[model samples]
Target chain A: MQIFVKTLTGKTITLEVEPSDTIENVKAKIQDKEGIPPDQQRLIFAGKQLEDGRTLSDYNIQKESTLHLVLRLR
Target chain B: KQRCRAPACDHFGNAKCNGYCNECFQFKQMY
Candidate 1:
């Protein structure tokens, strides 16, 4: 899977992912890379929770699948 | 099905989805 971030500043960042990890972990990872606060992060993968605590394999996310981490304005 | 106006809601609908919530689907739509 490929996780990506579209910064409000017009920057696009992406990361490759394995199927065994959950979406929550991915979110955490995104936070780490983006330097965005978790609460402030508006993560919507296809529009769901990303969610609270689920794995990529759980959702059957495929390789190169891009996850968008859009940071919500304060 | 219910319609959630909030984009954060799982019930939000979109063209990719047939009245189903677009929550998780958005990830799949990522280009």
Candidate 2:
């Protein structure tokens, strides 16, 4: 399915992802896109909330679901 | 308008990913 990540500045990046992929894995791909480390990324307000180990299916993530990508303070 | 995010290329109103054209997007995936 298609997933969208909106950056802090409202720049929207798109990705093709699987429902079985974990949120951690998702961030890993996001890492590839934005050079942001997985451990440093956070997705807020998902199907409910997000967990690193939880699959997108667990959150009932749908096509074109937009996730807010916020970075952790270093 | 119609332009790529690459900052070098022209003719790219359509974004395939991260506001980049397909050329830029695919090249990045080339990693």
Candidate 3:
């Protein structure tokens, strides 16, 4: 499915992913897009933090769901 | 693919990542 990752600067990037894929896996794809490391990124869905060990299916992420991308201070 | 945002960075990424080098992408922080 296609997921939208909304960044802080107001531009959102589309990522190709599977529901079965882990949050870490999703971040890996994000890295491909903007070159930020997975460790430095935090994916939030709706209101909760999407953990690296969790899957999109576990979070009930559906098509076109926008994941808010937060960057670490370091 | 279009040029990766910067005039200096001419390489287009495979979709977005390849649009610019990883280092450049890190600075631009966008696909």
TM-score per candidate? 0.53, 0.65, 0.69
Tell me which of candidates 1 and 3 scores higher on lDDT.
Answer: 3
DockQ leader: 1
lDDT of each: 0.56, 0.71, 0.74
* Candidate 2 global TM-score: 0.65
> How would you encode candidate 1's per-residue C-alpha lDDT over A13-73 as one tens digit per residue?
7766777776666666767786656665665666554665777777656766545555433
Highest TM-score against the true fold, candidate: 3
What's the candidate order when arranged by decreasing lDDT? 3, 2, 1
Cα lDDT tens digits, model 2, B1-31, are: 5675543344363644767666556544543
Model 1's interface RMSD: 10.0
Q: Write the per-residue lDDT of candidate 2 for residues A1-74, one digit (tens) a residue.
A: 89988765457899889999999999989988888777756686443448999988888788888887655433
Q: lDDT by residue for model 1 over B1-31, one digit each (tens)? A: 4663333443455655644345434433342
Docking class of 3: incorrect
- Which CAPRI level is candidate 2? incorrect
Query: Which 10-residue window of candidate 1 chain A scores lowest in summed lDDT?
Result: A65-74
Per-residue lDDT of candidate 3, residues B1-31 (tens digit):
4654433333454445545545446655543
lDDT of 2 at A71: 55
TM-score of chain A of each: 0.65, 0.89, 0.95
Per-residue lDDT of model 3, residues A8-72, tens digit only:
45468999889899999999998888888898787888778889998999999998998887665
